[PDB]
Structures are given as structure tokens and as C-alpha cells.
Amino acid sequence: TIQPGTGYNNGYFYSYWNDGHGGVTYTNGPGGQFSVNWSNSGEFVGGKGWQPGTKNKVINFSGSYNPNGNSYLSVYGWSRNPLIEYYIVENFGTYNPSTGATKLGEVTSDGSVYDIYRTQRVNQPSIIGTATFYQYWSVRRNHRSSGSVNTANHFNAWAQQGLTLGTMDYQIVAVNGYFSSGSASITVS
């Protein structure tokens, strides 16, 4: 595993964070590749992409994603001003992260309908410190672990619905886990 943190590997920005509970390892491979292996983990997120992201990136990803419990595979990132955490969720494990959330529309992109949602985090950690901020979600109906994500289709649909993004911070293809097990090997470009 590598040490939790952020940096660059083979031209790609990466972020790997965990809560210190144990049970997760993350490695950076050649090009845009990363692997995650976890067994009775705590909370974590890791992946590769860009810092800063853009609002018209076409993100390609390919590989394998085998969660056993609560985990997502997504295009994941933040904006500033307004502070927003967002996810374009391509696959997940036992928990659909939109459960109970307010649905804000639908968008069709890259071979599937996605359902759009908005949630709120209250006094939670963020890229700028503890804060209250909205989260935006596009959740793919047709789950997959390879493909292409035309991010503009999502960001434009969000904007149409009143879900505004500020200036982009990082933008990665990420595996999230919350107290679960699994394995994944993903290559980004």
C-alpha cells in the first residue's frame, strides 16, 4: 500500500484517504491505474484523475470492481464557491447512496439513464474544513465497471435543475468504502 495522502503518479493526480481503522490497501500502478483491496475496512476513498478537474472532461475507465458490502465506484470530485461534493456513480455494493434522497431529475448519458439527487452534509469535513455543503449525485441505472463518462452531460443537467457548481477542485475515478470488504483494479484516462 502507499501512504494516505495526495500527489501525482505517472501524470495523474491521486488521492487516498482512510479513517485509520485498518483493513484497506491502495496502490498506484502504471499510467492511470490504481488498485484497492479491503477486508473489514473502516471508511476510505482512493483513486486517480485530475487536479483541477474540468466541466467538459470525457473520463474513460476500465477494469474490475468487486465490492462485498458498502462501496461505490464513481467519478468523484469537488467544487469551490459554492463548495460542492459530487458523484457520478457507475456502480455500488449493498447501499445505493441516493436512498432517501431528494430526486432532482434524470439524465441520459453514455448508454444509461441516471437519476439525479441532492443531499446535504451538515458540519462535516470538506476540502476547506468543517462545513455545511450540498452533495450532487447522478446514479447510473445500468451498473458497470468500464466505460466513458461525459461529465458535461451531468454538469449541464445539474445546472438545468438548479444544482450549480463553482470552480472545480480535484476530479477522480474513485472507489469509496464504508466498513466493508472488496477488491478493485481500475485504469483511468
UniProtKB/Swiss-Prot annotation:
Subcellular location: Secreted
Keyword Secreted: yes
Glycoprotein is among the record's keywords: yes
pH-activity relationship: Optimum pH is 4.5-5.5. Stable from pH 3.0 to 8.5 at room temperature and from pH 4.0 to 7.5 at 40 degrees Celsius.
Any one GO biological process: xylan catabolic process
Induction remark: Induced by D-xylose, dependent on the cellulase and xylanase regulator xyr1. Repressed by glucose through negative regulation by the crabon catabolite repressor cre1.
Keywords from the UniProt entry: Carbohydrate metabolism, Glycoprotein, Glycosidase, Hydrolase, Polysaccharide degradation, Pyrrolidone carboxylic acid, Secreted, Signal, Xylan degradation
Sugar attachment sites: 37, 60
Active site: 85, 176
Positions of the GH11 domain: 1-188
Entry GO CC: extracellular region
Residues the record lists as binding substrate: 72, 76, 87, 121, 125, 135, 170
E.C. designation(s): 3.2.1.8
Main subcellular location of this protein, as a coarse class: secreted
Catalytic activity: Endohydrolysis of (1->4)-beta-D-xylosidic linkages in xylans
Superkingdom of the source species: Eukaryota
Pathway linked to the protein: Glycan degradation; xylan degradation
GO MF: endo-1,4-beta-xylanase activity
Similarity comment text for this entry: Belongs to the glycosyl hydrolase 11 (cellulase G) family.
Function statement: Glycoside hydrolase involved in the hydrolysis of xylan, a major plant cell wall hemicellulose made up of 1,4-beta-linked D-xylopyranose residues. Catalyzes the endohydrolysis of the main-chain 1,4-beta-glycosidic bonds connecting the xylose subunits yielding various xylooligosaccharides and xylose. The catalysis proceeds by a double-displacement reaction mechanism with a putative covalent glycosyl-enzyme intermediate, with retention of the anomeric configuration. Produces xylobiose and xylose as the main degradation products.
Record-given protein name: Endo-1,4-beta-xylanase 2
Organism: Hypocrea jecorina (strain ATCC 56765 / BCRC 32924 / NRRL 11460 / Rut C-30)
